[PDB]
Amino acid sequence: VAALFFLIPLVALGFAAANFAAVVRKPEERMKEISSYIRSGADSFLAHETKAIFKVAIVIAILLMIFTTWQTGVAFLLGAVMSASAGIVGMKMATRANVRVAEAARTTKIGPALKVAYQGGSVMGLSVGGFALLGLVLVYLIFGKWMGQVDNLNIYTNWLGINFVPFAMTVSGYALGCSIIAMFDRVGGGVYTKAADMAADLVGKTEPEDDPRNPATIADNVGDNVGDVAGLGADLLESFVGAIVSSIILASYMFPIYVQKIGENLVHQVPKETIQALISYPIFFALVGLGCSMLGILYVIVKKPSDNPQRELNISLWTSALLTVVLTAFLTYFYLKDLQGLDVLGFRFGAISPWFSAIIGIFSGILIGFWAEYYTSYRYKPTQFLGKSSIEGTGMVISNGLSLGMKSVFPPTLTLVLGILFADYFAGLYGVAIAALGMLSFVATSVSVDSYGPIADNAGGISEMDPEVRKITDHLDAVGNTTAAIGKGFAIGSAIFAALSLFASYMFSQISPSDIGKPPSLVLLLNMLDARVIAGALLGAAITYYFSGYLISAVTKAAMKMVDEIAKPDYNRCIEITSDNALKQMGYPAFIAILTPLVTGFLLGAEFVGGVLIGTVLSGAMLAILTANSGGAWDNAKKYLEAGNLEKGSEPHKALVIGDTVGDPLKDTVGPSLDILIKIMSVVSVIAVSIFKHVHLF
Amino acid sequence: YVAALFFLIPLVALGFAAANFAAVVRKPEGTERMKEISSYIRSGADSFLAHETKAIFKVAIVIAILLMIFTTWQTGVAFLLGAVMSASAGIVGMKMATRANVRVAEAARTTKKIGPALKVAYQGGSVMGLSVGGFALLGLVLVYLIFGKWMGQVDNLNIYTNWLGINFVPFAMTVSGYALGCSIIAMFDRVGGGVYTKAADMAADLPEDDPRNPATIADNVGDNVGDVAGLGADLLESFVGAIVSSIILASYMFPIYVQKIGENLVHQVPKETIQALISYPIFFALVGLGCSMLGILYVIVKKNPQRELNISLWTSALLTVVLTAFLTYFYLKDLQGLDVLGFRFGAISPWFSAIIGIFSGILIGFWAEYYTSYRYKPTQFLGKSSIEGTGMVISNGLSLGMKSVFPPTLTLVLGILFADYFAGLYGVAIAALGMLSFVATSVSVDSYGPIADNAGGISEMCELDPEVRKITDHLDAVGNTTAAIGKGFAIGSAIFAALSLFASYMFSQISPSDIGKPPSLVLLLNMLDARVIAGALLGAAITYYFSGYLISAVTKAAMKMVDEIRRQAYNRCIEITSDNALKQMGYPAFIAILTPLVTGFLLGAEFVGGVLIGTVLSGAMLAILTANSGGAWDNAKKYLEAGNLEGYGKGSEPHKALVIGDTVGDPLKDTVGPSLDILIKIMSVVSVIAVSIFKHVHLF
Ligand SMILES: CCCCCCCCCCCCO[C@@H]1O[C@H](CO)[C@@H](O[C@H]2O[C@H](CO)[C@@H](O)[C@H](O)[C@H]2O)[C@H](O)[C@H]1O
Ligand SMILES: CCCCCCCCCCCCO[C@@H]1O[C@H](CO)[C@@H](O[C@H]2O[C@H](CO)[C@@H](O)[C@H](O)[C@H]2O)[C@H](O)[C@H]1O
Ligand SMILES: [Ca+2]
Ligand SMILES: [Ca+2]
Ligand SMILES: [Mg+2]
Ligand SMILES: [Mg+2]
Ligand SMILES: [Mg+2]
Ligand SMILES: [Mg+2]
Ligand SMILES: [Mg+2]
Ligand SMILES: [Mg+2]
Ligand SMILES: [Mg+2]
Ligand SMILES: [Mg+2]
Ligand SMILES: [Mg+2]
């Protein structure tokens, strides 16, 4: 049967490739040229990024093999290739799918055209899911079972003298690869995306607002795809992989931590069989999630498309989530029934214990999404207050947006607090990680619905460059914008969950062979009364704020570089100038996110790094929530004024447009980069704590 | 004996502040037309003060009743004592400031020079500074004497069990009540006064001020309300909190270090050493107040203003350094058990911590300056970005604040690390005390600031000579820069004091059953506990929500004043704002006060510790960001107005972008930041107190 679960990744990959081929079959003369224009620009950006990322990955794998065991470097390469493949597939799928849906809208008059766009987005969603789970299964087989990485499950010592559970180190390397690709995609692509929006909206004003023949306008469509299709997909992939890797690390290290030396011999209080089963269970959970998501997507694409698009995708999400719930019910119920010693791990239900954590994480993600919706949409009270206040002043608009974000911080944080508390009550930290996984159990469906958004935005833009077709694409673009906001909120929540699980794995990875005799209370400890920890937390929070602030100036500078530049059309592909600049400009923030654990870890030690991690996680969650919600609220409040639904080209509209020019880079670059900051720093620290746990120079 | 010459320092400061008040009152006011407007501001400020005092004393009565019911009466008495001390300091400073602007302006005209008028302005600010210092040290010395020695609360130093059954060391509980009173008065002053101040600023603008706008008078009153009363009370609170943290740490380190070795319970740290450590921070603060008075005396005697005030600060600070040197070397030379407390250098060890705080505060101050003034690169870049667009100005301001967080935070981190290395958590608290040792001088310069601002408004009131206006106008800009530095110093010291208070919270978490437990096990807040992590997330969310509510409250109060001004066709508009502001402060204050209680009784003490740490982190970061962003926006607007930018003058499009960004920055820098400082510190105090009751009483 496990051979029939291993088949789910290949099934998903083949089904996504088939969806790609079928949309290639979908029909697209003047309109087709622009789609070719955008596809070529996206391919140039992807090539530049891929070259840079693979050079960096070569260096990363070399360092990993030199300073740790080599299998971790090999797994890093595997995961990086998986993520790059998913991103490239989705973007290539979409660049040629943007116009196809428009041709579907005219030929099908609304209704059938949406089926094409969703079959497109499903390509990227299933690609993310299948590639991630494929990399993980290959790591568990080739390294886990083939090489006997689960057979040992004892502290292996590197040739230089580094101690670690080998399979935990390998899964950590895989998570690191995913994190590197996700960081490059989102940080660099977001810098480029908001530089393109800023350059387009400024060039319209430079010499008309969003001109169609503006090169930066084409770049902006490309950036929407780079951000919410490729970048967001990679971010969700990273969070999901991180949750799974945290679960696996926790199990592997609960193997050595729960031992008792009554005499010379050492008796494992948790048998190796239990540790193996706990290492394997999250993978089975993710595979079940992928299966349920594919079933839901199949029912959605096949059945008679209703007029209301949002209800269809919402029902797809509900199907995936609740089906995964009910099925992993049995998986959790039987798989963990035979394990021995689960009361020591903290399981309040034995076999089904973690399933509760998973489901509560699912509902947590759902609720946080709903919260983001409530605070960022014109259909609810807060955005309406901002839109109506637009008459009061421009400074009033900015202050009200900042206050709205600050207030919105609370509800989702309370949701996450309750989810964490109940997941802990159920199954300890392993269950907290399992709850994060459950939240991201249907990561494939989430990524697909998120990719849908940019395609709809591109369809509306295509209408802007038939009256019924233009209006229908505009409505599709608005629904896509709402879905993208919901996706950003869900991604932030899952990122907080993954970063917390990775901090837990970091504390668990800090186990040492000398601590074997010590009780569990001594090893799994990061005291907050130690001055080193407090200083580390302050430093991590300040670094998170510094990263978020730097992203704003980077977007502005890249946009200014695009402004400096610029057969009547001939060939204009300025994107590289911005993209290359973005790839250079994102260099410094990345150096922070990766190198902060090492220096402070080698300067002060592992306890200081834990404080840096917790402070960074907290500050990043808060700042990301604030920035994302502020940007989304400014955008849709401006949309409300555009329709004039209540309360165009006026003074209030000027205040709103300035607030949106500020919010775009904040919600589409800073926010989306902060979660990556927290999670990748957690991963890098989890890995390097093996080296600077005892190697601290002060 | 000899301590009786330190016991006199608070009364000395109080008498000297009264003497400064009398000597300034002797000074003439000059022209009558300006004096009339000054009288109007005095009446408005007094009405606001009366409303505030009535509300705050009602709330303090309720608080003291509950405290005495659930704890020892000595704690309620000390709470009322501290509240009265802070209220007296605030009222005295406010009267001095409201009545001191006209003296400086008329002195500028009479002596045709800035020097002589500045002597009056500094004698004014010194009233508030010395009032803060003297009242604080007086309350603390009275608590150390009447309760500490007379009843033997420093004699016993053992766990007393209340009638309801709550356990605690008595003197720690008493000092905590004192800190609670100070915190309540500071919350009222800063939260309410900031809401009103920025509502009046928003009403004023909703070439500097409108003609006879009622909000013009309101804004003149609010400038005094903020940097004289509010900022002074905040610095006083941080300084008192550092001292109380040191004292609590000593009181609880007495019982925590016990060993049943030797065939009987042996206190590892002798009671004499614990007594000396309880007394040392008080004497250090008294020495600091003395040095501050000496420095201010040297400054006022002799006939560029900033260099003079900077020299006052340096004199006070370095004199405290060199004097607490011998204080530390002799007082603690005979102490026993410092190796258990963590002193790696014995007697003078903690003295280093003190200086490490002092030099850190200075550095942190300078850091604020660097990021918030147009005389340095960041504000210049913002002013130049004024040309590209308004949204660019807003984005660049936000980015500047987010980046500015780092330098001062790194300073604080290194200071904390070195203070720990020197003398443990006790030394961290001692360093907070040293940083705020010259609180009188800091508060004095901070009060000087708006004395100068409204005096410049006073000079521009009526009409006045352009040459005369320039001399008074120059005083106002120096005040603005110094006030930005003071806000930075206050935020940094508040973070440091709140950290010391969290350490005191963990030490207060000691229980008689935990007496047998090892020292490492009792003083522990694991960050891997899900309760703790959830508490941190909740605290950060609460901090952000608090800041957002403060923004909305400022806007609502400004709208109320605008609507009342529409009705007009005196002091009625000020009262309306005061009422609205006090009602608005009900909700955030209730958050800050009841969050520890609810979270502790629902979940427990570890969740409360997590809430505290998360709130401290988020509040420090948000306060730094808001204060620096607002100040930098203001100075960049000045850069464009000053003509440093060429081609663009007042009323230009770049200036429009800069002024809009400044209207956004104002409420953030004058309300959100200072109220965040108050929030973090008061939540630390409330948790430190209530952990005695909900340590084991958590219902979920
Ligand atoms: C179910 C998967 C089986 C393979 C089918 C894959 C086709 C669907 C993916 C389309 C997107 C990529 O576009 C595809 O890229 C790869 C090269 O990189 C090339 O495709 C070829 O190489 C790949 C990899 O060696 C093989 O799967 C296959 O022999 C062939 O499809 C083609 O140039 C192009 O069809
Ligand atoms: C067992 C027999 C089969 C063994 C086959 C192994 C072959 C491995 C050598 C592959 C060499 C090609 O290496 C290629 O590099 C470029 C990046 O520069 C990537 O190529 C990918 O991105 C680039 C830039 O967008 C585009 O050409 C294209 O979209 C895509 O093919 C792929 O990573 C890889 O296809
Ligand atoms: Ca927008
Ligand atoms: Ca100002
Ligand atoms: Mg836009
Ligand atoms: Mg547009
Ligand atoms: Mg977009
Ligand atoms: Mg668009
Ligand atoms: Mg567009
Ligand atoms: Mg103003
Ligand atoms: Mg003004
Ligand atoms: Mg004013
Ligand atoms: Mg003012």
Hey, is the C-beta of A599 within 8 angstroms of any chain B C-beta?
no
Largest CA distance in chain A: 87
Residue B411: name the closest of B480, B307, B496 by CA.
B496
* Beta-carbon contacts of residue B384 (< 8 Å; ≥ 6 apart): B645
Experimental method: X-ray
- Residues making up chain A, counted from first to last: 698
Q: Which residues of A424-453 are buried (b: 16+ CB within 10 A; e: fewer)?
A: bbbbbbbbbbbbbbbbbbbbbbbbbbbbbb
- Rounded-to-integer distance, Cα B178 and Cα B70, Å: 16
- Rounded-to-integer distance, Cα A187 and Cα A196, Å: 14
Residue A634: name the closest of A653, A649, A656 by CA.
A656
Residue A606: name the closest of A543, A683, A695, A535 by CA.
A695
Give SS3 for A26.
coil
Q: Which residue of A has its CA nearest to B400?
A: A549
Residue A629: name the closest of A463, A454, A447, A411 by CA.
A411
Ligand nearest to the CA of A635: 3
- Rounded-to-integer distance, Cα B45 and Cα B574, Å: 8
Q: Give the 3-state secondary structure of A334-403.
A: HHCCCCCCHHHHCCCCCCCHHHHHHHHHHHHHHHHHHHHHHHHCCCCHHHHHHHHHCCCCHHHHHHHHHH
Q: State how far Cα B398 lies from the chain centre.
A: 24
Cβ count near B649 (within 10 Å): 12
Q: Give the burial class of B467: count Cβ atoms within 10 A of its Cβ; 0-12 exposed, 13-18 middle, 19 or more buried.
A: exposed
Query: What is the distance between the terminal CA atoms of chain B, rounded to a whole angstrom?
Result: 53
Ligand 13 centroid to Cα of residue B168, in Å, is 46
Domain count, chain B: 1
Ligand 2: which atom is nearest the Cα of residue A92?
29
Q: Look up tokens 């081609």; give the residue.
A: B647
Residue A640: name the closest of A304, A449, A356, A397 by CA.
A397
Q: Look up tokens 């808060």; give the residue.
A: A622
Q: Is A561 annotated as belonging to a binding site?
A: no
Enumerate the residues of chain B whose CB falls inside 8 A of the CB of residue A254: none
Give yes or no for a contact between A503 and A613, defined as CB atoms under 8 angstroms apart. yes
Hey, is the C-beta of A550 within 8 angstroms of any chain B C-beta?
yes
Chain A, chain B: beta-carbon pairs less than 8 Å apart = 223
Residue A189: name the closest of A673, A573, A560, A549 by CA.
A673
The DSSP result for B467-495, as a single string, is HHHHHHHHHHHHHHHHHHHHHHHHHHHHH
Residue A506: name the closest of B208, B146, B459, B527 by CA.
B527
Hey, is the C-beta of B427 within 8 angstroms of any chain A C-beta?
no
Hey, is the C-beta of A543 within 8 angstroms of any chain B C-beta?
yes
Range of the structural domain that residue A623 is part of:
1-698
Enumerate the residues of chain B whose CB falls inside 8 A of the CB of residue A528: 525-527, 532, 609-610, 613
Cβ count near B212 (within 10 Å): 9
Output the CA torsion sign for A247, A250, A253, A259. Answer: negative
* Beta-carbon contacts of residue B585 (< 8 Å; ≥ 6 apart): B187, B188, B191, B192, B195, B553
Residue A633: name the closest of A663, A662, A672 by CA.
A663
- Rounded-to-integer distance, Cα B317 and Cα A428, Å: 51
Q: Which residue spans within B124-196 are E strands per DSSP?
A: 160-161, 167-168
Contact B614 A618 (CB under 8 A): yes
Output the CA torsion sign for A99, A104, A105, A107. Answer: positive
* Beta-carbon contacts of residue B4 (< 8 Å; ≥ 6 apart): none
Give yes or no for a contact between A526 and A682, defined as CB atoms under 8 angstroms apart. no
- Rounded-to-integer distance, Cα A36 and Cα A462, Å: 12
Kindly report the CA angle at A524 between A512 and A266, in degrees rounded to 5?
50
Give yes or no for a contact between B567 and B644, defined as CB atoms under 8 angstroms apart. no
Encoded tokens for B670: 């004058």
- Rounded-to-integer distance, Cα B1 and Cα B419, Å: 32
The DSSP result for A203-272, as a single string, is HHHH---S-SS-HHHHHHHHHHHIIIIIIHHHHHHHHHHHHHHHHHHHHHHHHHHSEE-SSSS-EESS-H
Beta strand B266-267 pairing with A156-157: unpaired
Hey, is the C-beta of A659 within 8 angstroms of any chain B C-beta?
yes
Ligand 2: which atom is nearest the Cα of residue A81?
33
Encoded tokens for A694: 């005892």
Q: State how far Cα B95 lies from the chain centre.
A: 19
Q: B267: part of which helix (H) or strand (E)?
A: strand B266-267
Helix axes A232-257, A70-95, angle to 10 degrees: 160
Q: Is A197 annotated as belonging to a binding site?
A: yes
Give SS3 for B160.
strand
- Cα-Cα-Cα-Cα dihedral of B527, B533, B535, B538, to 10°? 140
* Beta-carbon contacts of residue B109 (< 8 Å; ≥ 6 apart): B30, B465, B468
Residue B437: name the closest of B561, B565, B292 by CA.
B292
Whole-Å CA distances, A280 to A245, A259, A283? 11, 21, 6
Ligand 13 centroid to Cα of residue B200, in Å, is 8
Hey, is the C-beta of A429 within 8 angstroms of any chain B C-beta?
yes
Give SS3 for A333.
helix
Whole-Å CA distances, B25 to A336, B220, B230, B447? 83, 20, 23, 17
- Rounded-to-integer distance, Cα A130 and Cα A138, Å: 12
Ligand nearest to the CA of A9: 1
Hey, is the C-beta of A558 within 8 angstroms of any chain B C-beta?
no
For this experimental structure, what is the resolution in angstroms? 3.2
Ligand 10 centroid to Cα of residue A557, in Å, is 30
Q: Which residue of B has its CA nearest to A398?
A: B664
Give yes or no for a contact between A60 and A590, defined as CB atoms under 8 angstroms apart. no
Ligand 4 centroid to Cα of residue B197, in Å, is 11
* Beta-carbon contacts of residue B284 (< 8 Å; ≥ 6 apart): B324, B327, B328, B354, B430, B433, B434, B437
- Rounded-to-integer distance, Cα B658 and Cα A355, Å: 55
Beta strand A163-164 pairing with A259-260: unpaired
- Amino acid, res. A697: L
The DSSP result for B72-116, as a single string, is -HHHHHHHHHHHHHHHHHHHHHHHHHHTTHHHHHHHHHHHSSHHH
Q: Give the CB-side neighbour count of residue A689, counting CA atoms within 13 A.
A: 30
Hey, is the C-beta of B586 within 8 angstroms of any chain A C-beta?
no
Residue B90: name the closest of B285, B254, B230 by CA.
B230
| CA of A635 vs chain B CAs: smallest distance (Å) | 14
| CA of A20 vs chain B CAs: smallest distance (Å) | 40
Query: What is the distance between the terminal CA atoms of chain A, rounded to a whole angstrom?
Result: 53
Strand partners, B266: B259
- Residues making up chain B, counted from first to last: 700
- Rounded-to-integer distance, Cα A186 and Cα A237, Å: 12
- Rounded-to-integer distance, Cα A88 and Cα A230, Å: 8
A203, A206, A385, A398: best mutation site toward chain B, by most B Cβ within 10 Å?
A398
Ligand 5 centroid to Cα of residue B637, in Å, is 28
Beta strand A163-164 pairing with A156-157: antiparallel
Ligand 1 centroid to Cα of residue A15, in Å, is 13
Enumerate the residues of chain A whose CB falls inside 8 A of the CB of residue B357: none
Kindly report the CA angle at A605 between A603 and A611, in degrees rounded to 5?
110
Q: Is A194 annotated as belonging to a binding site?
A: yes
Contact B412 A528 (CB under 8 A): no
- Rounded-to-integer distance, Cα B323 and Cα B284, Å: 9
- Rounded-to-integer distance, Cα B434 and Cα B418, Å: 14
Q: B259: part of which helix (H) or strand (E)?
A: strand B258-259
- Rounded-to-integer distance, Cα A61 and Cα A70, Å: 8
- Rounded-to-integer distance, Cα A47 and Cα A43, Å: 6
- Amino acid, res. A404: L
Output the CA torsion sign for B560, B562, B568, B571. Answer: positive
Give SS3 for A186.
helix
- Rounded-to-integer distance, Cα A557 and Cα A214, Å: 19
The DSSP result for B562-611, as a single string, is HHHHHH----HHHHHHHHHHHHHHHHHHHHHHHHHHHHHHHT-HHHHHHH
Residue A17: name the closest of A104, A85, A89 by CA.
A89
Q: Give the burial class of A334: count Cβ atoms within 10 A of its Cβ; 0-12 exposed, 13-18 middle, 19 or more buried.
A: exposed
Q: Look up tokens 């609460």; give the residue.
A: B542
Whole-Å CA distances, A441 to A19, A229, A675, B13, B270? 22, 19, 19, 67, 59
Hey, is the C-beta of B613 within 8 angstroms of any chain A C-beta?
yes
Whole-Å CA distances, B243 to B74, B137, B322, B424, B504? 18, 10, 19, 15, 11
Ligand 1: which atom is nearest the Cα of residue A17?
8
Ligand 2: which atom is nearest the Cα of residue A46?
25
- Residue in A407, A543, A621 closest to B548 by CB: A407
- Residue in A556, A626, A666 closest to B544 by CB: A626
Q: Give the burial class of A287: count Cβ atoms within 10 A of its Cβ; 0-12 exposed, 13-18 middle, 19 or more buried.
A: buried
Kindly report the CA angle at A288 between A282 and A289, in degrees rounded to 5?
90
Give yes or no for a contact between A300 and A316, defined as CB atoms under 8 angstroms apart. yes
Q: Which residue of A has its CA nearest to B406?
A: A542
- Rounded-to-integer distance, Cα A451 and Cα A192, Å: 18
Contact B410 A542 (CB under 8 A): yes
